[PDB]
Design a binder for this molecule. Sequence first.
Ligand SMILES: [Zn+2]
Length: 411
Amino acid sequence: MFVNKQFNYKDPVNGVDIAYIKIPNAGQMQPVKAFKIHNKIWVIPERDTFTNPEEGDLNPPPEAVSYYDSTYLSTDNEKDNYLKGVTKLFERIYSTDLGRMLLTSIVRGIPFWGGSTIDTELKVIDTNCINVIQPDGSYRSEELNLVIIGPSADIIQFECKSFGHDVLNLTRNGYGSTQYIRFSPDFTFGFEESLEVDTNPLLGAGKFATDPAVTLAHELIHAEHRLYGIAINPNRVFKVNTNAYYEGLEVSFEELRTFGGHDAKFIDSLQENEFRLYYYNKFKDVASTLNKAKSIIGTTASLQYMKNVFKEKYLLSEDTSGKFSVDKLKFDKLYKMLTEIYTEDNFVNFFKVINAKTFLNFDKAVFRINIVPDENYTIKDGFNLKGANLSTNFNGQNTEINSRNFTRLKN
Ligand SMILES: [Zn+2]
């Protein structure tokens, strides 16, 4: 039971799990009503005009596969439906053995306390917190790992972003940072079934719809990489040979890794090893820092407690002297888990749903949906409901047969 509380958008703020909050480096934004659905995880049912200054408007630009609608997610009823949809997709993910593991890793992935210039001092990094406004008007600083928020101007432009430090590369130095996922459970993408020799022939018809749970899981996978600070520099790309009418189509390693399956292998053995050794060295640096720590600032939590928190996050070894170190095989297990086990491909297999076979199989259309009603979608079966006739040949994802659950919007 990932979310052990029924949340309704209109419930009164209580300063604990329902509250008006303020995001870091947000200039001066007005507070926004947010909900804490699980330890370290909040949801803001608002269009994202806070994380980025240059994107503080929901106005359509000169366009370029995108979708715009400045009125989307503007009403309380919409925010309530949004909140319910996100919550439901989390339960769907959490209900699988793979999803339970990923979310556990995410919750244990507290961004590192590496904000001090004094090496014998442990200190938090402010951008890894939110200010929770209380009933009396005061604000409480609270640390969090994950925030799910609505999309910015481009409604279907989902992504995992974070604030970053002046000098440190939090998502790539092993530290990690609070992750903000722009996402919407109100839309999903359509993809065409690649007719292959050995693929089920009884497949309903034309377009199939992506299970929004796979989409969220995909983003949660990026978030896990970023929380453990082992994300691959977005600069590292593979030049995919698409056409002969193209002397080039870049796809980043971070993406190929996240999608997993056959595409992940485009990251050769030399590069894999390179990344693994690099982060292993980075975890060792975290160990040293913890060892040289004698005091903790922003006091409340004890020093040994915070050290334990990170000993647990990085699966560090501790001897009788109380000194931490990185165990090669524990590191390998953790690293493998975060990069090879948690993948969109493995989720598609656990969920047993149809999905694009590779990024190469680019989606075609954008559909409007509503997974909240059980008559439409359930935690256990997605769109492919049991008693229904939709539980056969993925009829539930067939946007022709299950025409009532999908409303074409673009392309
Ligand atoms: Zn991605």
